[PDB]
DNA sequence: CGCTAAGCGGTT
DNA sequence: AACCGCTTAGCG
């Protein structure tokens, strides 16, 4: 029943977000724990950004 | 509605 | 542990 409150991103947050994905499809546990600090998200929040946006990258192109 | 963040069951 | 493929649901 108990959601997580929808994550509501920062325009600089989905910029730096969109240019991390540009430059790799994919984040190293280490990248992954880097952006989040830079833009003072959780490192589950960056996670399911990425996995979201692979997965909006897959329908787009398909 | 459309976009997308978070949840679920299953994959690797 | 992270991903996949899809679903659920929040909000503009």
Do not use: C, G, I
């Amino acid at each position: 029943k108990p959601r997580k409150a929808r994550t509501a991103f920062s325009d600089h947050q989905l910029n730096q977000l969109e240019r991390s994905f540009e430059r790799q499809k994919y984040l190293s546990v280490q990248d992954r724990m880097d952006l989040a600090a830079a833009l003072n998200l959780t490192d589950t929040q960056v996670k399911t950004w990425y996995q979201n946006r692979r997965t909006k990258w897959k329908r787009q192109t398909a």
